[PDB]
Amino acid sequence: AAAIGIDLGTTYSCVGVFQHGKVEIIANDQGNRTTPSYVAFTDTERLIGDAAKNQVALNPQNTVFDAKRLIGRKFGDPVVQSDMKHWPFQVINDGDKPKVQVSYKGDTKAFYPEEISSMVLTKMKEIAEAYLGYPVTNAVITVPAYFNDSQRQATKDAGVIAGLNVLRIINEPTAAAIAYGLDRTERNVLIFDLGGGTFDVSILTIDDGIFEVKATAGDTHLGGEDFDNRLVNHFVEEFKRKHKKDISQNKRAVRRLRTACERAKRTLSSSTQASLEIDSLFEGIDFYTSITRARFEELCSDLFRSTLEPVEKALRDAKLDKAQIHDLVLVGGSTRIPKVQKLLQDFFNGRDLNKSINPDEAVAYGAAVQAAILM
Ligand SMILES: Nc1ncnc2c1ncn2[C@@H]1O[C@H](COP(=O)(O)OP(=O)(O)O)[C@@H](O)[C@H]1O
Ligand SMILES: [Ca+2]
Ligand SMILES: [Ca+2]
């Protein structure tokens, strides 16, 4: 029986299996090679992944996400108290431990972060089992390099609740390096990891297969969703101009526009323009418009440039110059943005980016390789 590698990401998760010298990144029931880190509770069902995220506009109070921001933290942790303002779902205190409180089948229920994450891991486990055709019992799960003992244990506990023997908890940047075979080489590797909600820069030194985390930098609240937000605000103003109506206080309309903006953003990574066509956005008014890559880049120019500041800090903390970095590794779904690739490459004076592996799959890819080694 094959062991699996799971990237348990802030906003998306990804599962891979290493068989016959190569990694299969496993598509879910909807054909998606990543799955939202989302759990929704309704009057009749518990939804996980695509089904959960797809009804977020309908059911905001009972659609749980960002469990990774809570996992292994105390309720009184300043990060928890600060983050609670970003969430439409209720977080309560159960003996200095945070629980997400929701309505499920007409009853008030509360879940520990590792319980929510266990449901995401169960989905990823089931996705792998559908592909392999037998039950999976062994997994490597990845965490950020800066995760403490509490956050690592809570992540492992999520795995155990999901019915997995957790072979090892390994660092996300290390998994990304393993995906590119950089573990087999001192080599200095910079991991540039821009996801949906978080930006992580890591400098690893690899010496005879041994990894040392020399520096970690970034922004725990900078991600692709910030770029979506810049598009949302742009189109809210456009709708005001054309229809003399403010949609900003209609939560459903804003969430539906946000979904359309995220889809348009993805198109702008491969095309120089994208069409944004929403039926009945507000008071039965259809919103059919477009966005150029250039305008998108203008709207996010400051946010894109800000990604180089943690790169500068990481190099300074690692006591390394640009030329002393041997390999640049692009990971996280947001690194598909051409302007982000340009900024990093230009900063490193034309150096190649390791980007041949789907950036939102590289961490799961490496986890799958390491899972097979440990088996
Ligand atoms: N082609 C693309 N162009 C731009 N952004 C993309 C593209 N594909 C995915 N993304 C973005 O990647 C982010 C998710 O990154 P991922 O690493 O999968 O998740 P996580 O947030 O869990 O780290 C989202 O903001 C999504 O919009
Ligand atoms: Ca943000
Ligand atoms: Ca990611």
Numbering used by the authors: 4 to 188, 192 to 381
Paper text:
Like typical Hsp70s, BiP consists of an N-terminal nucleotide binding domain (NBD) and C-terminal substrate binding domain (SBD) connected by a hydrophobic linker peptide. In the ATP-bound state, the NBD and SBD are docked against each other and the SBD adopts an open conformation, allowing fast exchange of substrates. ATP hydrolysis to ADP causes domain undocking and closure of the SBD, leading to tight substrate binding. Nucleotide exchange resets the cycle and triggers substrate release.
